[PDB]
């Protein structure tokens, strides 16, 4: 995903938003 649940700190795109 890439509307909400991708935040910087993460580094990364978790799975879902």
């Known amino acids: ?3 909400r649940e ?3 700190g993460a580094e ?3 799975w879902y938003c």
């Open 12 to 14: 990364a795109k978790p």
């Open 6 to 8: 991708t935040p910087e």
């Open 1 to 3: 995903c890439g509307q």
